[PDB]
């Protein structure tokens, strides 16, 4: 049980200001294709996209020859933590943190350094992993 609104997580823990920079959009999407929470301008995902990321977690490195397709836009897979964190580099970028039951997706654009979007997204995932989510 959680009195914490998932929309409170994305607005206050994900879209907060770090070093004078913000995240473009962010969303909590489950291991089911359904999104648990999201921001306003975050893209409208599709079913095959989620399945492709989840398969990359079960077998690290199976999404790099094809690429990370979030919202139909393809991102080059700079896979970092095996089974924990998957990244992307369109030009912009994206980072995905795997929780026990969901995924934390944060889309960063210039001038946000990619490490900023990662520290922010990775901390929310660990917060949910240690809470059972």
């Amino acid at each position, epitope marked *: *049980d959680d*009195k*914490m*609104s998932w929309q*409170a*997580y994305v607005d*206050d*823990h994900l879209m*907060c*200001e*770090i070093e004078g920079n913000h995240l473009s959009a962010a969303a909590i999407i489950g291991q089911d294709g359904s999104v648990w929470a999201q921001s306003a301008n975050f893209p409208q995902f599709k079913s095959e996209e989620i399945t492709g990321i989840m398969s990359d977690f079960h077998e690290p490195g199976t999404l790099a020859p094809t690429g990370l397709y979030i919202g139909g836009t393809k991102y080059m897979v700079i896979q970092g933590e095996p089974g924990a964190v998957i990244r992307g580099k369109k030009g912009g970028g994206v980072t995905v943190k795997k929780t*026990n039951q969901a995924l934390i997706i944060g889309i960063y654009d210039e001038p946000m350094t990619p490490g900023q979007c990662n520290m*922010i997204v990775e*901390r929310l995932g*660990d*917060y949910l*992993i*240690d*809470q*059972g989510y």
Partner: antibody
Amino acid sequence: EVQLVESGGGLVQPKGSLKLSCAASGFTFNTYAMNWVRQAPGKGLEWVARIRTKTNNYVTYYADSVKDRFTISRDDSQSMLYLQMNNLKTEDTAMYYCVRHVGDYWGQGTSVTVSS
Amino acid sequence: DIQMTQSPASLSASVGETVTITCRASGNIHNYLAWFQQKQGKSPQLLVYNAKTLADGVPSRFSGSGSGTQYSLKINSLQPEDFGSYYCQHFWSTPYTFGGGTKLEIKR
């Protein structure tokens, strides 16, 4: 329904060692990371240790005062969480709780008095 | 190590007054702040976690607010049950650090 019970406190002679315990009941121990928090007898609360879940490879985080002296470990099979306190000093004398993540549910407490 | 400074260190107010305990940090903790209430001889209890989300069965008079390094907890219309010691803890990075604490003597 959820309950956290601690034991193993007492009086320890300096240059002695101690292992505290935390019995979990009412929740899934394997999905929650557990902390240890100490409150000095008259002074305020202080954070002494933290261990993460299996998904995060059971990474153990310690505070500076206890970094080279304490040791945390968990057995999710028996649903218990322990803390090993070595090289006990007078300053370590405090009240110890076992805390689940942010601190939604706490324990009653067990105190350590490092006296002769 | 994000260390937190807590104040007022000792607060005294009558029943019904508005009181605010402010908690500040060494660095940005990104709304990962918790507020605890500890009555004497008892374990601490979670009033507000994640800066603004109140815990289960927490009176609406307790208010969580802030961003960055400046956080606070507001208790409007303080009741007899709101006595105790109030501590704040951050969960951005270990060492998760506490504050000094606030002894709130609710005159009645």
